[PDB]
Amino acid sequence: MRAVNWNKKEDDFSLMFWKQNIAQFWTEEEIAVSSDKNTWVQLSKEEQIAYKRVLGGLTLLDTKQGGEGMPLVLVHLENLQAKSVLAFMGAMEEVHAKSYSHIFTTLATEEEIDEIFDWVDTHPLLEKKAGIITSYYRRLLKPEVTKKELYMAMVASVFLESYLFYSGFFYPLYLAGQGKLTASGEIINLIIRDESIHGVFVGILAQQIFAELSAEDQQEVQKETQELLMELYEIEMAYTEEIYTSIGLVEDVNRFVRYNANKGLMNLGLEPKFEINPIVLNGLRTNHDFF
């Protein structure tokens, strides 16, 4: 049985991503959020509800990535250096999820917080969205998986990392780009810096597996991938309508979702399939290069 041996490179990129994930390490204890209350109380009721709801959705996604997506992909990898990187990325998803709780504690009462998590648990679109992604993960709960099954779990992971979070990230960035809730915005920028490299890394791994598939299996997962992209898009468009109609931002968020969908595809070595709001860009400017 093999032990991980970092003296013998297993690929040309795992050490670089190991080192970068470590260099980027942070915890919620490092950004105090209390100074955001001065601008939080200046938001309308409808704006505050949208903010809390999107943070709830982001928490759900990070919960499933750290608790299912990273663990189940990594258990089936044969490359032990890449496995190490994914284990670390999975832990950072739990840091991210804890960081949303840190923001909530500063901005909401204990009663309001528990209402938000109850709304998350019973929300039909979030359930559908998370269910579609985790289905591909839970296919890997068996002793032996095919490369097609592993490839599609990696696709699902890239689409969560590079695409599904962004209908939620939009709003903290949009407010931060206006000088509102800028400490929470700093946290969301740290999260985005991590998710960006998670999506690139899993995409590299996916491209390596794809090259190992037969031509028949390549064409099958190419079709499944495009269908998944558009199945998620349909749900995201319904989600943006629900969250953002009250505050007038639906079409802006949809453009941002398409931008990031295109990035997810590029992380998989795939051509864009769709066509950034400048205020969002200013909110990233504290990432700005990446976008």
> Within 13 Å, how many C-alpha atoms sit on residue 78's CB side?
6
Alpha carbons 242 and 233: distance in angstroms, whole number: 14
Alpha carbons 88 and 201: distance in angstroms, whole number: 12
Q: What track of x and - describes contact with Cl ion for positions 139 through 178 (by CB under 5 A)?
A: -------xx-------------------------------
Give CA separation, 121 vs 3, 49, 63, 247, 285, in Å: 40, 16, 12, 23, 33
**Which of Fe ion, Cl ion, its own copies, none is residue 52 near (CB under 5 to 8 Å by kind)?**
none
**Which of Cl ion, Fe ion, its own copies, none is residue 146 near (CB under 5 to 8 Å by kind)?**
Cl ion
Please name which of 28, 159, 205, 43 lies closest in space to residue 103, comparing C-alpha atoms: 28
Alpha carbons 99 and 82: distance in angstroms, whole number: 26
Minimum CB distance to its own copies, residue 176 (Å):
22
Match 């998620």 to its residue by tokens: 232
> Please, which residue, 137 or 151, has the CB nearer to Cl ion?
151
Minimum CB distance to Cl ion, residue 205 (Å):
15
Site residues (vs its own copies, CB under 8 A): 1-8, 18, 22, 25, 27, 29, 56, 59-60, 62-64, 66-68, 70-72, 74-75, 80, 83-84, 87-88, 90-95, 97-98, 101, 104-105, 110, 113-114, 117, 120-121, 126-127, 130-131, 134, 138, 141-143
> Please, which residue, 86 or 148, has the CB nearer to Fe ion?
86
CB 153 within 8 Å of CB 137: yes
Per the annotation, the verdict on 136 as an active-site residue is: no
Alpha carbons 164 and 90: distance in angstroms, whole number: 17
290: left (phi over 0), alpha (psi -120 to 50) or beta: alpha
Q: Is 111 exposed, middle or buried (0-12, 13-18, 19+ CB in 10 A)?
A: exposed
Residue list for the binding site: 62, 93, 96, 161, 195, 198
Alpha carbons 240 and 53: distance in angstroms, whole number: 11
> Please, which residue, 242 or 252, has the CB nearer to its own copies?
242
Q: What track of x and - describes contact with Cl ion for positions 246 through 285 (by CB under 5 A)?
A: ----------------------------------------
Size, binding site for Cl ion by CB under 5 A:
2
> Please, which residue, 198 or 263, has the CB nearer to Fe ion?
198
> Which of these is catalytic: 100, 136, 137, 259?
100
Minimum CB distance to its own copies, residue 215 (Å):
29
Minimum CB distance to its own copies, residue 155 (Å):
20
Please name which of 32, 28, 26 lies closest in space to residue 182, comparing C-alpha atoms: 32
CB 175 within 8 Å of CB 281: no
Alpha carbons 176 and 183: distance in angstroms, whole number: 8
**Which of its own copies, Fe ion, Cl ion, none is residue 198 near (CB under 5 to 8 Å by kind)?**
Fe ion
Alpha helices (runs of H) in 108-214, residue ranges in sequence order: 110-121, 124-138, 147-159, 166-176, 182-212
Q: What track of x and - describes contact with Cl ion for positions 59 through 98 (by CB under 5 A)?
A: ----------------------------------------
> Please, which residue, 154 or 265, has the CB nearer to its own copies?
154
Minimum CB distance to Fe ion, residue 70 (Å):
8
- The residues carrying an active-site annotation are 100
